[PDB]
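Hello everyone,

My group is preparing for a crystallization screen and wants a predicted model to guide construct design. The compound we'll soak is OLC. Before spending weeks at the bench, it would help to have a computed complex in hand. I've included the protein sequence and the ligand's SMILES below. Output in structure-token form would be ideal because that's what our pipeline reads.
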Amino acid sequence: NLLKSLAAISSMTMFSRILGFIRDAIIARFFGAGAATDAFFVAFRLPNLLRRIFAEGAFSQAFVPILAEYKNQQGDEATRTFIAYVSGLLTLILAIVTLAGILAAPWIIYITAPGFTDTPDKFDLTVRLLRITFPYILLISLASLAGAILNTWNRFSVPAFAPTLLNISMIISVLLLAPYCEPPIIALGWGVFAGGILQLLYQLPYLQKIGMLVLPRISFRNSGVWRVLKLMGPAIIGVSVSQISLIINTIFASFLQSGSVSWMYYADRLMELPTGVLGVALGTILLPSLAKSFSTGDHKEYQRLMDWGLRLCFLLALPCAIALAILAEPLTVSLFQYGNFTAYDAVMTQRALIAYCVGLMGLIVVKVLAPGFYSRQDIKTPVKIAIITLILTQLMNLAFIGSLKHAGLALSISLAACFNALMLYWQLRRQAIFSPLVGWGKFLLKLIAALIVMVAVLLLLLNFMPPWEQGNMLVRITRLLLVVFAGAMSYFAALFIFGFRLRDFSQRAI
Ligand SMILES: CCCCCCCC/C=C/CCCCCCCC(=O)OC[C@H](O)CO
Ligand SMILES: CCCCCCCC/C=C/CCCCCCCC(=O)OC[C@H](O)CO
Ligand SMILES: CCCCCCCC/C=C/CCCCCCCC(=O)OC[C@H](O)CO
Ligand SMILES: CCCCCCCC/C=C/CCCCCCCC(=O)OC[C@H](O)CO
Ligand SMILES: CCCCCCCC/C=C/CCCCCCCC(=O)OC[C@H](O)CO
Ligand SMILES: CCCCCCCC/C=C/CCCCCCCC(=O)OC[C@H](O)CO
Ligand SMILES: CCCCCCCC/C=C\CCCCCCCC(=O)OC[C@H](O)CO
Ligand SMILES: CCCCCCCC/C=C\CCCCCCCC(=O)OC[C@H](O)CO
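Reply:
Good plan to model first. Here are the tokens for the complex, ready for your pipeline.
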């Protein structure tokens, strides 16, 4: 049951996600949304996101299958040797990249955030934070490799808990080290650094428990390393396209007023809060199922899995996007507006979040529909569609920046994701790969009715409540949780009244 899989993934990631939002709230309270946070987000978050794009789009899809074949077809000694050579090559490459990026950090910041050049102190702070960021890439890459090995041995709780330590270390660095750092946010940077270390050392004993903890070594003649490189080859183009798109979006953001990057960051975090599970969970668990369907010839199961993923997208991401748009002020004020995060920052974050809610659905649908081509050994069509999406994204950025500013950049990304999803779906329909099952009309009608009930309940409750800035954090968060509970319970109650049953949707998972 893939619904069971999504529940398990949610339960395993809950604690880390909660602490990540506590960390974001601490950052907002102590540093607000200004030049220092902009420098931190450009220097740390952008390289981390580029690294994650490369790791999940290229490295893992090549390393995990070869590791599983070593585990199942070869012995533990040959597998340990393969792991040692993999880790050694990764460590050497990332050490070279760390050195080169520390030496070239000013030009890196220059081309990724040109608008920062009119403020020399902000630029220097960004370059300094990037110089601290670069070793974290190597640390967190080794930690990710450990997590992948542990997942291959069916150990998912430990890697899903690992980022808790990063969040805790960042929080402690802000609370205890920021008063002693000359630019205070510098402490946060080191809190990330130590975090990486912790995330590694937390997973090393478990690696030793399964007999897969080995010293790294270098070898340019290992069969497995060449197998992984050959499988990594055809994904570099797809990785580079999304990397370039993110870099140009950052370039556009760098020319806006101080705080725009931070407002966008807080908005996208708020958007990720309820739907962080579905996005990646559905994709990673649907790709192997559809691959097996296509290999066995069971086209009915392929169609049913795809249709179930799409219907779950409609059933869970749509109400979240609508409710996030409606509750933008309650969310921003109850979660962020404390200390140096002012009401102005709250309003700007609300604008960006409302812009992001338009494309939440496009993102969740893209992550489900891309395996429709990936499972059939088709990397070319998603890359073509992604190139077109990049072109449209930059066109809309150029058109929207002067008037809508940061919110306009967010809306550009949202519309681009929407049309990315639509192009993927229309390609699937065109090649006769997928055709939806019967009963989408009644499904959508009941969905619309439940959504109307939810919106009515939300607006009714919001019309009765005092200004959200009055009251301390306890009061605000209690009110927000109560309103969210009422909205969600009304939505699911309407869904049940109109015929939706949990058993019936679980049967479509498998
Ligand atoms: C809006 C300003 C005029 C148009 C700029 C388009 C730049 C396009 C290319 C950027 C990549 C990096 C190349 C180097 C860019 C340096 C830009 C710079 O330093 O701009 C400082 C200025 O004060 C800022 O308003
Ligand atoms: C820079 C300074 C860094 C200082 C770092 C200090 C870290 C202290 C540890 C706290 C434990 C974390 C919270 C534990 C809460 C319960 C954890 C638990 O039981 O988790 C089991 C796990 O899910 C099974 O996989
Ligand atoms: C104020 C609120 C702002 C935020 C709002 C967030 C939600 C927006 C999403 C709407 C769903 C639209 C779905 C349209 C796409 C599905 C139908 C479709 O694609 O139909 C053509 C297809 O070819 C048939 O096979
Ligand atoms: C916000 C828009 C962009 C982001 C989201 C992109 C969604 C892409 C399509 C998803 C599956 C749609 C399946 C539609 C199946 C319709 C089948 C049909 O013929 O339905 C007959 C019924 O009577 C009346 O619809
Ligand atoms: C790996 C690197 C890949 C690089 C790929 C090439 C990037 C070339 C430049 C992009 C557009 C820059 C546009 C800059 C000017 C538009 C923003 C103008 O922004 O004004 C801002 C102002 O604050 C309100 O209007
Ligand atoms: C059907 C859809 C129904 C609605 C779906 C959800 C919509 C968004 C609501 C989220 C509330 C989250 C409340 C808790 C947020 C985390 C707060 C926390 O633990 O830390 C923040 C604090 O400020 C640190 O000091
Ligand atoms: C234009 C200049 C931009 C400069 C700023 C960005 C530089 C760093 C980004 C990527 C390189 C490093 C990529 C490292 C990938 C490691 C993959 C890995 O370890 O993956 C383990 C596991 O498989 C995971 O699931
Ligand atoms: C991980 C990424 C590594 C970099 C990827 C390519 C970036 C190319 C961009 C611009 C030219 C940069 C030329 C840099 C020439 C050396 C500068 C140098 O060594 O400067 C030392 C000085 O002390 C100050 O740190």
